[PDB]
Design a protein around this nucleic acid. Structure first.
Ligand SMILES: [Mg+2]
Lengths: 95, 106, 82, 97, 95, 106, 87, 97
DNA sequence: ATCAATATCCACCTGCAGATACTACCAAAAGTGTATTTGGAAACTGCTCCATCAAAAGGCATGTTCAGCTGATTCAGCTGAACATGCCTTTTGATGGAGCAGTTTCCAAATACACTTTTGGTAGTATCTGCAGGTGGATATTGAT
DNA sequence: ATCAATATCCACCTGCAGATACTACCAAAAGTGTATTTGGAAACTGCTCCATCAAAAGGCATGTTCAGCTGAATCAGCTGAACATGCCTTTTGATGGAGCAGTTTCCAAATACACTTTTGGTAGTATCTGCAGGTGGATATTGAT
């Protein structure tokens, strides 16, 4: 009865942009969902730690950014950082 | 009403991400951009894997992505492999690979 | 035909795993060794999973119990929740 | 009257099994072994079906990968036959010993 | 001249308790101080997660307890569990 | 006028441990037994290591425990060695240990 | 500040004898001549990984000085926790 | 004219160095190396001296442990001489690759 | 070489397990407008300790010499691979009931706030002591013979 | 065995670094007490989904045979250890300021609370289809000769 949340539909939206004729098994989706939750935790976890090291009460994008740098490998980190700074720009300017 | 995701141009739920961050005891407080940033990054990474896993599907003459396609995607890319190097993908098997000294002689 | 359960993990099953692992030729003593190793693995993981179960005041080990045990053992698994 | 040379089938199986992803241990024996082991920690236990599965997935992944390292250790010693010492060396270096 | 706290006097008390004619070098104390902070962080973390997994907002001595069984090895865990139980029992009855 | 430490029969500081639990954002709420139980465990472990470290000091005819003695203590005890198996003690050195085959003759 | 000396090839300060000492502490009796270059490589990788993270912490804090704490936190992320320097 | 047989000083040194705890790499060289690598990531950086010490303690600890593992790999190969292949096998198995 | 036994390849077909599609639905997030609380850059400046210079302590570089290790060669013998299938264990599916999970309740315990006290840190200036590093002097280890 | 070159182990000493000490003091603690909020245990209960088991499926225990691997024995070539030797580089101790880190003001930003709108999970019933699993026949691979 209790509603069981998931990233599955967002994963699915993104699947279509990337491969509009391609589908995905249940098992595969479950894996993708673990993946998102994992990376979520890793990044938030590091960010938390950063704030604490620096006696700050807040997790701001700067923390998520540094977190991403520390966790992601070279090229992945760079792109992710750009996608990240991008989305925040776009969001600020939008009314 | 217009979703923060659509404002940020994202398929991934800025709202949910924001929430999950608060109810995560990650810190006392949570700036407004952090979930946007975070959500972008997750979207991004999701795309990359889905891209490569699709390509993997293609190679094997398939249109439905299965675990095996996620495994082949991840372990054939140096960077994904490293990020997921202490992770096990259920039902992924392994990359075909045989040590050359084990091959029969010509 | 009285027999320990560890021995249910048979020569041919162990041989298959090795094969997936790229192994061509296998000493006969491997099978006992491998069972020993598997038993330590399961102990360590199961111990931790059950500890989760007991904490949740349950009598059923859930897949999330196992998943969380694997994560803290450094063996994160994807596809069974979390 | 036709026989295959030692190691031809071995190679054949490597290729076969590297290609598939099925679990290679029979479900039931494994399930018992799991339950037996859990019994020493708490009695009257029940197991979700997916919990046993998760344990199997993980164990087989674990063991497959240990055979990779093991095999590298045999090759290091200029062999092609895995032996318990190779398993031991791998576990020691991994920090399991 | 900001006040830097440590567990040093407590480590010293306990030291006296067990080896009354023995001193400890400041580097040794530093390591001792690191060790306590470390184990604190590691128990508190396990506790944290455990609560979350069980949709609890509160960390009780029951959470700490499981964290200890999860984190420590066999015999250290058995005995650490005594001493904590003992201390709580004795804490409850002392008011 | 009594501290919670003395109330619980402890040298280690319960107030402090309470305080550090709140500000570390481990959960919304912190129960009253938690800092008691934890401070106890902390004290138990630090006692166990000091006992063993003290003996190493005495086995070397020294009165002041230094890092080498901490290291000898931890590495000589199976369970402390595992608990600290991924930790490095500055100035601790290693355990004397030469592999058999390396020694002279046969 | 006037002038700032150029750092190059310092990996070679990790001398043959110093590497031999570490092998000894590590219980090694005999050392092939190729070990020293290999070891220099391995050390260089180890340091790069730790220093990158350490410096990342430094910058995130908006500092110009790398603290013992930056290194300690870096070491912890990388599964090589160090006691003795404030953590 | 007098001589120890090869191996005798070597074991002498093992006992010596396993008994002590001093850093075995000279301070300044190691300092320069740190400063160099850092500079290559970021210019105009300073280091607390304990930060360099922390790195040195970590580095030597890392390297001494790597040589035990390396040594075990040689011995597995029925040698007593460590070679780069031993270091490499250690690091592969350790998951450093 | 050739010859044949068997494994592997590709194409085409087909039923259904497992995918996508769908609408009600409703409930629970997420977003919208109003009032409150709080955090942390900027501006300023004390002051720790980092960078950077000269003199003294000893470890490094280099060439020579040959001990003994490594790695090639060979080879006997042992040990694991391959093999056929009836036989016994696992798999598949059928069915009660444990328990997990949903819900509501109410109180013991936790948060909040406000004096009140205690204590853990430092700082200033003093005062004590374990032991590291020097000496010489007696015993072990090692290697030539 | 014997001799002897060299390392190692004591023991005893002595300066002094760094440790234990103590008296003044204080700000930030922890403690105490009273008011108000609520989390989670506790208790009933509904419905999955888990253990059990009968019937249907099919993988493996068996022992025999021998190819080919592992490991012992042997040996030459040469790498790496030991050591003597000349001196360069690091170590140790004593003097300038970049930048860290500690105080304070102030608004830009996040919290809170309540409200109003939609989205996303489920379930309902049905809707749809990619592909695993089977066929047939052409060709590759392996092994015997
Ligand atoms: Mg440079």
């Amino acid at each position: 009865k209790t509603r069981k949340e998931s990233y599955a539909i967002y994963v699915y939206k993104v699947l279509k942009q990337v491969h509009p004729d391609t589908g995905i098994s249940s098992k595969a989706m479950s894996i993708m969902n673990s993946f998102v939750n994992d990376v979520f935790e890793r990044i938030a976890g590091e960010a938390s730690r950063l704030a604490h090291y620096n006696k700050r009460s807040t997790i701001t994008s700067r923390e998520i950014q540094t977190a991403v740098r520390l966790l992601l490998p070279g090229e992945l980190a760079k792109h992710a950082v750009s996608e990240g700074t991008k989305a925040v720009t776009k969001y600020t300017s939008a009314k | 009403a217009k979703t923060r995701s659509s404002r940020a141009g994202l398929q991934f739920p800025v709202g949910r991400v924001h929430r999950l961050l608060r109810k995560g005891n990650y810190a006392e407080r949570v700036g407004a951009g952090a979930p946007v940033y975070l959500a972008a990054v997750l979207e991004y990474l999701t795309a990359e894997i889905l891209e490569l896993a699709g390509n993997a599907a293609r190679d094997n003459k398939k249109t439905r992505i299965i675990p095996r396609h996620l495994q082949l995607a991840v372990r054939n890319d140096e960077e994904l492999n490293k990020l997921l190097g202490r992770v096990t993908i259920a039902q992924g098997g392994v990359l075909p690979n045989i040590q050359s000294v084990l091959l029969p002689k010509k | 035909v009285l027999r320990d359960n560890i021995q249910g993990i048979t020569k041919p099953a162990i041989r298959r795993l090795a094969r997936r692992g790229g192994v061509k030729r296998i000493s006969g003593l491997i099978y006992e060794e491998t069972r020993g190793v598997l038993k330590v693995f399961l102990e360590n993981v199961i111990r931790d999973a059950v500890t989760y179960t007991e904490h949740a005041k349950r009598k059923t080990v859930t897949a999330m119990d196992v998943v969380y045990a694997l994560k803290r053992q450094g063996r994160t698994l994807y596809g069974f929740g979390g | 009257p036709h026989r295959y040379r030692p190691g031809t089938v071995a190679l054949r199986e490597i290729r076969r099994y590297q290609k598939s992803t099925e679990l290679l241990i029979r479900k039931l024996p494994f399930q018992r072994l799991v339950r037996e082991i859990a019994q020493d920690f708490k009695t009257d236990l029940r197991f979700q079906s997916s919990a046993v599965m998760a344990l199997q997935e993980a164990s087989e992944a674990y063991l497959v990968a240990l055979f990779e390292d093991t095999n590298l250790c045999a090759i290091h010693a200029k062999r092609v036959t895995i032996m318990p010492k190779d398993i031991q060396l791998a576990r020691r270096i991994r920090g399991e010993r």
